[PDB]
Symmetry: D2
Subunit: 388 residues, 4 copies
């Protein structure tokens, strides 16, 4: 009873994840820097499907065009050698001091122009390497104080940036879509578009909404105390789940980025249940940090437990949905009735229906139990492999 | 130096606010029930502009059509006697046991039909009394466990309900718009459409989006640790701030509904600054609970401090924006540059602009301070009336 | 592979738990009131060991001494008929309006005297029924605003109340100990002694500290975002874990009181691991609310899943600690070294030890990985019954 | 109406505060390193009383004994030149990789011995420079996973470390006391002794409790959603407020360390009210980070606003307590009765007092309002300088 990943499971990892040297706000690095080509090789051996990158993970900031080409060639050789793909890429608009007040919504106009040029350069590279999704995380877009940022003007600037990027892609004829990744705070006191809902809403105001979706992250919605499976369900309902970041988080605090399955384990179960039953077919991407307590052996153990926990939860969610006793419980709780239209008969028929109001027996309806606790204990028993 | 409300300030109160008897999850009522006509008279004397109501606040659940007409006539006489208006109304789809699994997204279809009929009956009354906004708070729409609610099916049911309501209003030719009020949790373990962003996003999928906006509440966004002024700015940017609920909240915990100005006082300052500078012209509605420690004298004192604190903050925000020294600080922090287009010259010009990349001096730009702390201390000094 | 409780597992339930009628801040009761004798009989059939009570759960507030004796006689007959015990009792100092500003720390002196008399009356009854622990939950002790409560004076009043109760018990020669139950907020805006640490600290200032310990609750420490197993470890270290309340909670929000095992499932695992390895021998008490969605069938299903989840977690924690591979991992992570004294050789020897400073190789020590992620994945695999 | 600090106000600053270069988990430094002698001179000009330091702030890690003496001599000259004092010192047991699993509670014994030697070396220096308080912040003492740390063994190790430090000080005859600074999380997933209450409780188990108190920090208790003034009141009640860290925090999230007065402004008001009315006489120490958006002008502006906001709040709290109308309101709310003993007449008299139970009119007592909202609005009006 083991749980071995293959490239067909579509598991991906950012370079910055296994590559995190362990520098935190209070401490120095505990691990040496990893060569991207070493991470590609090590992740391939563990059964991953591919890797993702920020521009600056792959090509050191300020590299000359000759060093750039060299970094890319070595990387490309490692992909060729391993069969690893690059399904997603993104921009670092957060590390360099120039970005201390944001990239696309910096108060300084010149910075905002530079942010766009830096992004466009990396869209070209991403396309070259075969990425289908381009992620935007505006971790520096926000404020620590109320007068520093007019948020209406800042959303104008953010719309302008994303519209220019959509013009660029369509003008180049690229097959690439954008995914906005929300986070509510950290490193800014408050970040703009802080949740999946705020990002979904914003997208509907862009000039070409069909080019944009979301890249939600488990731990970021949980930093606002929100139900991650519920947020993903809304993104799926809107047709905007382009990509996803998988990890774990213990409640409302700094962004922990624990390996997937740590943190809120029942939420991880209901997330896998949803992705698998909705048939999500994008990458299963891990955005996690091996704790700085670990050496490189602990790094690869942590990355392997990401994949393992996904597969165990997949098996338990599938057993849950396949169990006849669960299917009967779902009927008992009227999940079947939730899926039926309230009033396919139309408004006028509803208005004329005395059984909907005038003659509706509200006490009899009130008295019916929902049988949710029995259903939830079956879900617990399935998760724990304790079906008796 | 006093701060007296008049009806022209557009201050409104729910019947359920000053009428809260003080029943909490752990204790009995501490105050007797108020007659709606007494609350109308007492609020008029304090300088309020109008009141709002749930159906069941005004007409006892299960009232006959004769008792109904009587309740409404007495109410209407009190409005006539005082000049009070009714700008907003809403439905109770949360108290009665029949609603224990939701109204519009209850698993039982019959309940969902009943929820719609109950709502439509009250839209007619609201129109009769002159309301312009109809609020929907789905406090029972959600779940305590993951298998109880398929959230894609539940959003289908929620869309269906709101589309039927928009069909009704347009068929009747009513001048009334809908406002969805988000809350992240309580009384359900997780509530659907938990934040302003999730509600804005959902609205874009309705058949007639122009009929729907949001009614955000200070304390509800703060129950997710979010920046309320930032959420309001996004609602204003989308053109969807139809109504607002004003109160206070101390951080992430149960819904406190303190009087406005209690809770996060700096957030209240930045909220008033925004509403006044954006020229919001709807009601300034208070959804608050006088603490159950209070007798009726404490009730009216609490309601009066709601209005007082709004007026004091209005004065301090106006003094802030009018101060030449603040105007200079805003320029120093490049708020003027945030309001200018990043690239009105267009994409091609941006791509050809060497000063945006090839020759952009990133260290010089990085070195410029934002001068945000000096700006924020001027804002503090203005709030505290300590300008030296 | 089933998990059947017997009275020997020491599982107990408050009357108020299965008896909760489902009244919440926003809704009416969904269930009829249960007779205490029915709950005793139903819990006995499920395998419970005993029940606990507030005074007012058992004897209706304001009962005459004749009704009192009658309520107690019927109760006592049900205990005799079932073999159920009563290991713990407590006082309701929170429901009645008189307690709206607290019991022991109400500003009104007369209320504080009444709170003490009401408590003492119930200590006598508790002793009569064989309780060994008397719990105090000061849910009304606190404030919504800063000037309402001088907290130094309020701690004086709280000390005075607990000292008088300790004088009473010792004067009567009773064998009963007190346990303070912390909660950080709700129903008061902030509650005094909000966490296990604050209660432990307070106890050290009482006249007879040996009479007092803590009754921590899973969901209450999690309402402050704290690690419940860590808080219990500190209570065990102090010798003050007199009693415990078991339930589940999804993060920082209102007090959910979900059945045990819901909420934070990994925390529940580490809690059971600790209680079992420290050999806690008190009651395993459930303070939970069957969700108001449920009818009485759902009530008893929820109570049975409390016990079931405890037993499953007990089995998985025991398998974890017994696994040789885990024992090797614990050594790899130097848990054995944590249990050894840092400096049993004494201060002077430490000062003279050059290998502790002058010649300590800090880079070699820094380079050693802690191997925590491999250990934590073994714990995950054990929890999920996925050991491969 | 200005608010100028002098050395007599006892305002102090850590070297690491104005010296923070702005490195965060996601970005590089935005400011150059400050010489400690420059910070001493600049803080003296702003009206500060003194500075505090970690060992490694003052003497670069790994410095030779000759460089050490040089660093100290230059520092000492700057103190002499300015009249600045050093009232507090502390140890860095968090930055160096060797401390990745803790200092005093690292699993590796050798690390724990090294942590103690490093600490003792700095106690000698602190004494030399005149510090009266030695702070311990165990930011690396904790865990990200449940099996990594046995918390009973870890509290044994923590007790052992603090007892050895108390033996050292008493053996040397030093006049220095210890203050433990709690924090609930960050950089560890959970930190041991996470709140003021947990630290107070732990202290009572040390061999010489009179040597130890707490150094609470505004933003750290707020990272658990707790009421900071209430926690300080308990520390004052226990006689353990040895030192305090002043700053601001917006709710439950990463540790922001905003300047004092930012964050929760009403909490800052009630804190100053308490410190001033209890007559706290230790340093008013600021542990804050000027946001990384700022240049050095913004650094000194931020440090000056710390002091300014303290003085403005001091004035408003003093005006509040001195107002006759407030004094009358406090009586109306029975704050005077809270300060009187509940039962100075003793237990037996209480038991015999029929007016305390048998003849206590609970409805009349319940009906009395507490008049807390009127009191709290007077406090608001005083804070805002809006007394009408
Ligand atoms: O978008 C790219 C990634 O950028 C940064 O590494 C963020 O911390 C991570 O959350 C995000 O996914
Ligand atoms: O929508 C109507 C109102 O309904 C209920 O009273 C809710 O608690 C309140 O938040 C909401 O504003
Ligand atoms: O102390 C007795 C019990 O009293 C109340 O029911 C509280 O809600 C519960 O937390 C507590 O355990
Ligand atoms: O104890 C010394 C100081 O050490 C570190 O700088 C901590 O971040 C700060 O909170 C603490 O006060
Ligand atoms: Mn993250
Ligand atoms: Mn991410
Ligand atoms: Mn509310
Ligand atoms: Mn509301
Ligand atoms: Mn509880
Ligand atoms: Mn409890
Ligand atoms: Mn801090
Ligand atoms: Mn500090």
């Amino acid at each position: 009873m083991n749980y071995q990943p293959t490239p067909e499971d579509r598991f991906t990892f950012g370079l910055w994840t296994v590559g995190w040297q362990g520098r935190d706000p209070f401490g120095d690095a505990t691990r040496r820097a990893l060569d991207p080509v070493e991470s590609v090789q090590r992740l391939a051996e563990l059964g991953a499907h591919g890797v993702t990158f920020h521009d600056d993970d792959l090509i050191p900031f300020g590299s000359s065009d000759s060093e750039r080409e060299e970094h890319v060639k070595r990387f490309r050789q490692a992909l060729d050698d391993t069969g690893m793909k690059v399904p997603m890429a993104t921009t670092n608009l957060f590390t360099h001091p120039v970005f201390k007040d944001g990239g696309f919504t910096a108060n300084d106009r010149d910075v905002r122009r530079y942010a766009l040029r830096k992004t466009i350069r990396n869209i070209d590279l991403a396309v070259e390497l075969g990425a289908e999704t381009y992620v935007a995380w505006g971790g520096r877009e926000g404020a620590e104080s109320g007068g520093a940022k007019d948020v209406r003007d800042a959303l104008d600037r953010m719309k302008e940036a994303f519209d220019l990027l959509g013009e660029y892609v369509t003008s180049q004829g690229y097959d690439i879509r954008f995914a906005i990744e929300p986070k509510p705070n950290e490193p800014r006191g408050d970040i703009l578009l802080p949740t999946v809902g705020h990002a979904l809403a914003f997208i509907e105001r862009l000039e070409r909404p069909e080019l944009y979706g979301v890249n939600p992250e488990v731990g970021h919605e949980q930093m606002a105390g929100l139900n991650f499976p519920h947020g993903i369900a809304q993104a799926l309902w809107a047709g905007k789940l382009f990509h996803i970041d998988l990890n774990g988080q213990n409640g409302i605090k700094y962004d922990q980025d624990l390996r997937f399955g740590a943190g809120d384990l029942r939420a991880a179960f209901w997330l896998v249940d949803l992705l698998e039953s909705a048939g999500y077919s994008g990458p299963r991407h891990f955005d996690f940090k091996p704790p700085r307590t670990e050496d490189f052996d602990g790094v690869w153990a942590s990355a392997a437990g990401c994949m393992r926990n996904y597969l165990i939860l997949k098996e338990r969610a599938a057993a849950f949905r396949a169990d006849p006793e669960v299917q009967e419980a779902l009927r008992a709780s009227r999940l079947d009735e939730l899926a039926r239209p309230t009033a396919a008969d139309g408004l006028q028929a509803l208005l004329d229906d005395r059984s909907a109001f005038e003659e509706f027996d509200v006490d009899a309806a009130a008295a019916r139990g929902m049988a949710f606790e029995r259903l939830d204990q079956l879900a617990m028993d399935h998760l724990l492999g304790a079906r008796g």
